[PDB]
Design a binder for these strands. Structure first.
Ligand SMILES: Nc1nc2c(ncn2[C@H]2C[C@H](O)[C@@H](COP(=O)(O)CP(=O)(O)OP(=O)(O)O)O2)c(=O)[nH]1
Ligand SMILES: [Mg+2]
Ligand SMILES: [Mg+2]
Ligand code: NA
Ligand code: NA
Length: 326
DNA sequence: CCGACCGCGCATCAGC
DNA sequence: GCTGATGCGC
DNA sequence: GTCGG
């Protein structure tokens, strides 16, 4: 927050391009810029200064100029005085309502959290559940609740099968003192790049978590990815904890390190690490790192036995997860 | 300059 | 059913 | 929006 003014303004700009302009690459350009300036170790005093950075071009330089001069960006005050945009933007806050659906709703006159509640019939199940818990998902999860939620998830999967390994990734694993949600990586020795031995391996863990009333809703669920809602138990007279978004991702056990790396993030750290991997001749995903053929098609998976092994291929010294928040 | 811009799971729908 | 496209996510 | 072929 030494250049937080600058970075807030850029991310606000990015959220507008994605949610309103539906210009997803304008979104990313602003996000790279805000990430670079966040990692920049001096208070910025001029647009031309910040333009040396990669990701900052001439138009972001002029906005930084204006904001340093006025403590304000004109383009942003007009985006906040447009009802339409604030309506679109706010509807994207609902889990399940992207830019496309937000725009349709407001176009058909849904503009408020009241209007959505009177029109649940216009919403799929995912959206309905993001509305049902809209206020709780706007909240942050203190790290201390994360710790309780983790204890419950790891006890309960131990119960299903002692060979499951379960790892809380996302912002939690990067050391955050509060998280947006809980991200859980799951490995079992019978789910491996060689074959899906017993298949129900994720189902069985989702089902035990529902059984004990931890998982309360399902947004989506496939064979390797579960997207749902959970809640800590509360005692007999406390106000009860807000429901929370939980994500469980079942990776093949021989690809745990790539999977852990993807799932630990941050999202922007991942796009920059995957970009620099390309400029070293590899491609990384949650499963593998592979060298690239000059044909478009990637090579064979290279052996990995630690996160740092992946940094090494692309010639980067290790970054502890707490230095991956960008 | 005009294009390129990380990688992928799950749901839905279009065309078949 | 499917491929591939899109929408909304991680 | 920025950078690069
Ligand atoms: N490569 C890649 N990985 C991503 C992306 N988005 C998320 N991930 C990976 C990295 C990301 O860390 C992980 C979980 O994503 P979230 O839970 O949505 C965001 P978190 O970082 O946990 O912070 P929180 O808001 O929860 O406090 O999936 C993406 O666009 N690309
Ligand atoms: Mg998260
Ligand atoms: Mg998540
Ligand atoms: Na620059
Ligand atoms: Na959302």
């Amino acid at each position: 927050t030494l250049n937080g003014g600058i970075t807030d303004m850029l991310t606000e700009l990015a959220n507008f391009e994605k949610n309103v302009s539906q210009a997803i690459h304008k979104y990313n350009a602003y996000r790279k810029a805000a990430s670079v300036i966040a990692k920049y170790p001096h208070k910025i005093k001029s647009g031309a200064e910040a333009k040396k950075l990669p990701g900052v071009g001439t138009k972001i330089a002029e906005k930084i100029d204006e904001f340093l001069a006025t403590g304000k960006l004109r383009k942003l005050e007009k985006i906040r005085q447009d009802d339409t945009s604030s309506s679109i933007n706010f509807l994207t806050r609902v889990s399940g309502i992207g830019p496309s659906a937000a725009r349709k709703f407001v176009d058909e006159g849904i503009k408020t959290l009241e209007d959505l509640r009177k029109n649940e019939d216009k919403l799929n199940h995912h959206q309905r559940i993001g509305l049902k818990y809209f206020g709780d998902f706007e909240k942050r999860i203190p790290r201390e609740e994360m710790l309780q939620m983790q204890d419950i998830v790891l006890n309960e999967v131990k119960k299903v099968d002692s060979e499951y390994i379960a790892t809380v990734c996302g912002s939690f694993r990067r050391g955050a003192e509060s998280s947006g949600d809980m991200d859980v990586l799951l490995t079992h020795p019978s789910f491996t790049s060689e074959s899906t031995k017993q298949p129900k391996l994720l189902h069985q863990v989702v089902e035990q978590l529902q059984k004990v009333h931890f998982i309360t809703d399902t947004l989506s669920k496939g064979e390797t990815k579960f997207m749902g809602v959970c809640q800590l138990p509360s005692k007999n007279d406390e106000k009860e904890y807000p429901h929370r978004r939980i994500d469980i991702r079942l990776i093949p056990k021989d690809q745990y390190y790539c999977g852990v790396l993807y799932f630990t993030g941050s999202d922007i750290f991942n796009k920059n690490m995957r970009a620099h991997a390309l400029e070293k001749g590899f491609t990384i995903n949650e499963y593998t790192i592979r060298p690239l053929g000059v044909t478009g098609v990637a090579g064979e998976p290279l052996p990995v036995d630690s996160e740092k092994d992946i940094f090494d291929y692309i010639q980067w010294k290790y970054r502890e997860p707490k230095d991956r928040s960008e």
